[model samples]
Target: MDRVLSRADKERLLELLKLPRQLWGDFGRMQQAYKQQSLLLHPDKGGSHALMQELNSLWGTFKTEVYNLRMNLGGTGFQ
Candidate 1:
């Protein structure tokens, strides 16, 4: 099954990591922002399980989209 998040919801998730739409392709920026958010919001850090889970799920979805977009642009196949 595919993850289906509305634009507003996706925007909110990006906001959680303080990421802006223009920086989506900046892999280093994305990684740094995600790392900081994870350290602060991870369950091991006493974060809420539900919210953490939501973040985790959205993280995967966001990466998947980014990967697809990258590959589509280059016509590259996943190994």
Candidate 2:
């Protein structure tokens, strides 16, 4: 089953990843942003484990939605 996130949720995710809202529809950019954030958020880099876990969780949750948006498949429709 496919689940679409609400706008607020999307905004929260972007905020957590420290990405601009404009990157929402671009999967490549989102992935790159996540990768960069992950590096800085890694526990070995002096970041907390909780933060890294939250980032990973959020990325996992929205990854498919971002991909669908990129492919022009049925993603969260504009309101």
Candidate 3:
């Protein structure tokens, strides 16, 4: 049942992870983390100009693993 999402489908993965049940209770912690991750992916921070690209590519796969422990999801170009 797994297939590659079209380019337009990219946001759908994040959308999937946006459901209330998927969020952690630690909003402050998560917020801090979100900011931290953004910092990591920000080209200005000097990790990789492609850091955000890699992060976005990996987020959906990460979601499947973290939320459902479904480690076999496919189509993560960076995976």
Candidate 4:
């Protein structure tokens, strides 16, 4: 089942990931941070289930938001 995280959740994760103040500049950095965090936060790596779940949920929402923003921005941005 797909879970929907709120905008507040998204914002919090953005801050946690040290991403841009908003969806601007090279969005790839945001994704990079997420992937790196995922590995560290995986249950096998000693992360609690709840912690992993929240991080996963936050990243899922951030990914979708970044895709939509990029598309709407005409894919012309600072690489």
Candidate 5:
């Protein structure tokens, strides 16, 4: 299925995608930001549980689908 992302969401995804190999800053910056986001979104800390659950699901699906797609395209499936 095709995924629909808004402009802002696409920008956020791009930021996330490029976070690992951060050119100017350390990866810890991105890690910290993501953790802060999770703190605000996670239901464990009195945040929106349902929204957090959905977002967690989406991220999980995205990872699995992308890794499998890479494997199907002749990759080693190590991702």
Candidate 6:
């Protein structure tokens, strides 16, 4: 089975991470941004639990997509 993110979801994910559209396929950049955003949004940092949950969910979807793409292409270099 494939993990599919809607276009709007993709846009929202990028917006939440403050990332540009061109970098969406770049897993390295995405993971870096995710780490930064997660740190800022973590509950221990006084951020919203709801927002953090959303961020985690979206990041999971994005990661799965990247993994699937890499498998399909038969290469580890997904970027």
Please list the Cα RMSD from the true structure of every candidate, rounded to 1 decimal place: 4.4, 4.1, 12.5, 5.7, 7.2, 4.9
Best candidate per TM-score, number?
Answer: 6
- In model 2, pairs of residues that clash are none
User: Which regions in candidate 2 have their CA more than 4 angstroms from the true location?
Assistant: 1-5, 73-79
lDDT of 6 by residue, 1-79 (tens): 7666798987788988878988678788878888898899898987999998888888888777778766664556656
**Model 5 Cα displacement at 2 (Å)?**
13
**Local error of candidate 3 at residue 22 (angstroms):** 23
What does candidate 5 score on TM?
0.39
TM-scores of the candidates are 0.72, 0.70, 0.32, 0.64, 0.39, 0.79
TM-score of 4: 0.64
Number of backbone-clashing residue pairs for each candidate, in the order shown: 0, 0, 0, 0, 0, 0
Q: Which ten residues in a row have the lowest lDDT in candidate 6?
A: 70-79
Better candidate number, 3 or 5, judged by lDDT: 5
Error of 2 at 53 (Å): 1.1
Off by over 4 Å in 4: 1-7, 20-25, 74-79
Higher-scoring candidate on TM-score, 1 or 5: 1
Q: Encode model 2's per-residue lDDT on 1-79: one tens digit a residue.
A: 6555677866767886777997566677778888988898888887899878766767777876555556776657687
Model 5, span 22-56: residue lDDT tens: 44133345446556666777666777776666555
Deviation of model 5 at 72, angstroms: 9.5
Q: Write down the lDDT of every candidate, Cα atoms only.
A: 0.77, 0.74, 0.50, 0.70, 0.51, 0.82
Say which candidate scores most in lDDT: 6
- Relative to the unseen true structure, what is the C-alpha lDDT of residue 1 in candidate 5, on a scale of 0 to 100? 83
Task: Give the TM-score (vs. native) of candidate 2.
Answer: 0.70
Tens-place lDDT per residue, model 1, 1-79, is 8786777877777887888988767767876888898888877787878776777777778777877666565655779
Of the two candidates 1 and 3, the one with more favorable TM-score, higher being better, is 1
Question: What's the candidate order when arranged by decreasing lDDT?
Answer: 6, 1, 2, 4, 5, 3
Residues forming the 10-long window of minimal summed lDDT in candidate 5: 18-27
lDDT of candidate model 2 versus the reference: 0.74
